Design an enzyme around this catalytic site. Structure first.
Site, PDB file in Angstrom:
ATOM      1  N   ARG C   1       0.805  -1.222   0.000  1.00  0.00           N
ATOM      2  CA  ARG C   1       0.000   0.000   0.000  1.00  0.00           C
ATOM      3  C   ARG C   1       0.841   1.277   0.000  1.00  0.00           C
ATOM      4  O   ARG C   1       0.341   2.352  -0.334  1.00  0.00           O
ATOM      5  CB  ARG C   1      -0.992   0.001   1.156  1.00  0.00           C
ATOM      6  N   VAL C   2       2.113   1.152   0.370  1.00  0.00           N
ATOM      7  CA  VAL C   2       3.049   2.268   0.262  1.00  0.00           C
ATOM      8  C   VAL C   2       3.402   2.460  -1.213  1.00  0.00           C
ATOM      9  O   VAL C   2       3.512   3.592  -1.683  1.00  0.00           O
ATOM     10  CB  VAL C   2       4.308   2.054   1.147  1.00  0.00           C
TER      11      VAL C   2
END
Lengths: 83, 25, 138, 181
Positions: C1-2
């Protein structure tokens, strides 16, 4: 009515006919028996500059060689190319 | 009798050769 | 998700293309062995597909510098291995990587110092990969 | 029955669904070509058993309906020429058969419907051009239905999977609670 077709193309759904025997049709046909032909074509598509090359190549295999019915196939190819 | 029909051959082979000679031209 | 926020520009210039091509390949992959007569467009997706997949394979205990990673990922992405037999790619990369590390450190430095693959780097990598591919597939 | 068993079946029927759909699409394109080629083939056509079909199955009742020569690898394996159907038939194919020498073939009607010297080669060719148009339509049809049946089975199996998934969790918990109480 007059029907004139090859196995792939329909041309027509007095007729000058070569007897079939490779030659010109006037309303080029390869062979066959409504006029039925294995290959029927223009006339625009034929070359003709390469048929002379095909005729000479067929006359080259004739002076082979040799074994009967080989040979008879070569002569047929010479007859088709001459027409 | 036609030359091709002596040792062999059929009219089917005749037409097959003639048809191919048209394509190759 | 980064996601992308955690990548360098050199990786970001190739990781995006690779992600998209593998996603498109995954849609078609089930009939990779059941499509001898399907059209060229989906044949190309499959061909790029298990090439990039082979390039994601990696041995143990030799983690790679980022510039070495992108040099292999670029080669598959820009299409230089599409004609190479699938089963040979892992052994190709081992040989290819050893070759560039030993002989083209100047090239690998350029991808690091400049933080991307330039036109000059692209041209040099094309010459090395294509000529190397022909020798390896023999 | 058990989650592992359903898991394998689910992956299997999911692959089939995709393959059947792709096979429908290839057959749809092959039929499109065949129906175009059948038009001038019929006008040309107008003017021992032995049995005409193909090498490839998954086309419903094409081979069974038509079933010592037989053109098509299915003809001899059920009851000889191989490599038919995959590439569209030509007059050269008819010649090969006639040179090696009623006629039983599937006549094309629509996408759903089909029914069972030199002119010798013409009749073999006629049967060939009709057969493949029927075979490609029938395969397109059967694969469309198979892909639909696969879809409904995926749903049915996924529901069985999830009921079993929930039941396993509930049962384990009831055994734990009973032991603790």
């Amino acid at each position: 009515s007059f029907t004139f077709a090859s196995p792939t193309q329909v041309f027509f759904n007095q007729v000058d006919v070569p007897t079939l025997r490779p030659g010109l049709v006037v309303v080029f046909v390869s062979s066959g028996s409504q006029l039925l032909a294995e290959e029927a074509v223009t006339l625009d598509m034929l070359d003709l500059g390469a048929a002379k090359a095909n005729l000479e190549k067929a006359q080259s295999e004739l002076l082979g060689a040799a074994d009967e019915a080989t040979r008879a196939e070569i002569q047929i190819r010479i007859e088709a190319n001459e027409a | 009798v036609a030359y091709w029909r002596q040792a062999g051959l059929s009219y089917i082979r005749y037409s097959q050769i003639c048809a191919k000679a048209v394509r190759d031209a | 998700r980064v996601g992308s926020a955690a990548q360098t520009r050199a990786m970001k210039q190739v990781a995006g293309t690779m992600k998209l091509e593998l996603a498109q390949y995954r849609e078609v992959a089930a009939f990779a062995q059941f499509g001898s007569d399907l059209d060229a467009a989906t044949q190309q997706l499959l061909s790029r597909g298990v090439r990039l997949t082979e390039l994601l394979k990696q041995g143990q205990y030799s983690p790679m510098a980022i510039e070495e990673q992108v040099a292999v990922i670029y080669a598959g992405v820009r299409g230089y291995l599409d004609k190479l037999e699938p089963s040979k790619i892992t052994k190709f990369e081992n040989a290819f990587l050893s070759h560039v590390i030993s002989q083209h450190q100047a090239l690998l430095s350029k991808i690091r110092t400049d933080g991307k693959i330039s036109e000059e780097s692209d041209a040099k990598l094309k010459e090395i990969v294509t000529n190397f591919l022909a020798g390896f597939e023999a | 029955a058990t989650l592992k068993d359903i898991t394998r079946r689910l992956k299997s029927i999911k692959n089939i669904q995709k393959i059947t759909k792709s096979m429908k699409m290839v057959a749809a394109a092959k039929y499109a070509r065949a129906e175009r080629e059948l038009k001038p083939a019929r006008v040309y056509g107008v003017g021992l058993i032995i049995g005409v079909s193909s090498d490839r199955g998954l086309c419903g009742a094409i081979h069974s309906s038509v079933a010592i020569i037989g053109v098509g690898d299915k003809i001899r394996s059920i009851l000889t020429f191989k490599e038919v159907g995959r590439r569209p038939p030509t007059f050269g194919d008819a010649s090969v058969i006639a040179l090696e020498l009623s006629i039983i073939f599937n006549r094309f009607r629509s996408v759903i419907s089909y029914k069972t010297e030199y002119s010798l080669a013409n009749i073999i060719y006629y049967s060939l051009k009709e057969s493949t148009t029927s075979e490609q339509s029938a395969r397109m049809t059967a694969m469309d239905n198979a892909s639909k049946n696969a879809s409904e089975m995926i749903d049915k199996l996924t529901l069985t999977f999830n009921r079993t998934r929930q039941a396993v969790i509930t049962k384990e918990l009831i055994e734990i609670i009973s032991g603790a109480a």
